[PDB]
Each structure stands twice: as C-alpha cells, then as structure tokens.
Design a protein around this nucleic acid. Structure first.
Length: 139
DNA sequence: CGGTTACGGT
C-alpha cells in the first residue's frame, strides 16, 4: 500500500490518505464526513461561498470529499470523530455518485477482508505538516 | 448493501 493526496485519487479504487475533517453528519442509517487535505480534485463538488445560511466556512471550490461510513465504521466514528479532527483513512473505497462526483465509502466488513480503518491523528504529528502548510495558502 | 446531493446543524 501507499498514501495518496486527495488530488491523486480516482474512482473505483482502494486508497489511503491523511485529511482534516470539515463537516460531520450523523443519521439513523450512517455517518458522513466531509474531509480535505487542501489539494484539488476535478471530481469534487465545487463548494460555493455564496450560499445563504451555510455553516460551511471553507475550503471553497473542489477541495473536499464526502465519506459515507456504514456499520462498524459508523458506530465507531459517530460519537468520536469531530469537525476539525485530523484522520488517517486506510484502504477505503472510492466511487462516483449519480451526479458524477467522487465519493469515499466504508462498507461493513465483519470478515476483515480489506484491513479498512479510520483513526484520529494527533494534531502535532508531522504527517499533517503538508495539510497545515497548504491550508495557509487558502487562509 | 444501504443514501443523496454540498443543506440540515439532528
């Protein structure tokens, strides 16, 4: 395995990356994260700063990806991963939604076939240094 | 195998 920047991922592959969590949304069916590493991907949604009433404060344009967490991923993260946390996501699956946008999915995997995981990354870990340096450019 | 659209703020 190896890590990718978000600018480097493509649909229908397995990948791993470090990212900052911008937004979380829990539902009765799953847990959703919106994450960024401040690199651009042509298949990300172009987030608009002109929206009336959004709590989104950036990044704007094609800089964030939605991650849908199911089952044990959902139950583990839903009361744990917070807006602002840094995460490392390993061996997650990518797909394209019905409108053509890249999305990341963590399906239940009782059978431990894929060694898929998400964990919180301490803010001071040097692995996060490029994320922080790129974030400055947009800040 | 789910769930839909960049909000909502549960």
């Amino acid at each position: 395995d190896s890590f990718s920047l978000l600018s480097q991922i493509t649909p229908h592959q397995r990948c791993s990356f470090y990212a900052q969590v911008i937004k979380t949304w829990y539902s009765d069916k799953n847990f959703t994260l919106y994450v960024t590493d401040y690199t651009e991907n042509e298949l990300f949604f172009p987030m608009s700063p002109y929206t009336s009433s959004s709590r989104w404060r950036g990044p704007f344009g094609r800089f964030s990806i939605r991650c849908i967490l199911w089952d044990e991923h959902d139950f583990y993260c839903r009361n744990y991963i917070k807006e602002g946390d840094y995460v490392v996501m390993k061996n997650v699956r990518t797909k394209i939604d019905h409108l053509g946008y890249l999305e990341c999915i963590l399906h239940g995997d009782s059978a431990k076939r894929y060694n898929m995981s998400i964990e919180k990354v301490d803010s001071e870990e040097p692995e996060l240094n490029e994320i922080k340096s790129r974030k400055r450019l947009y800040v």
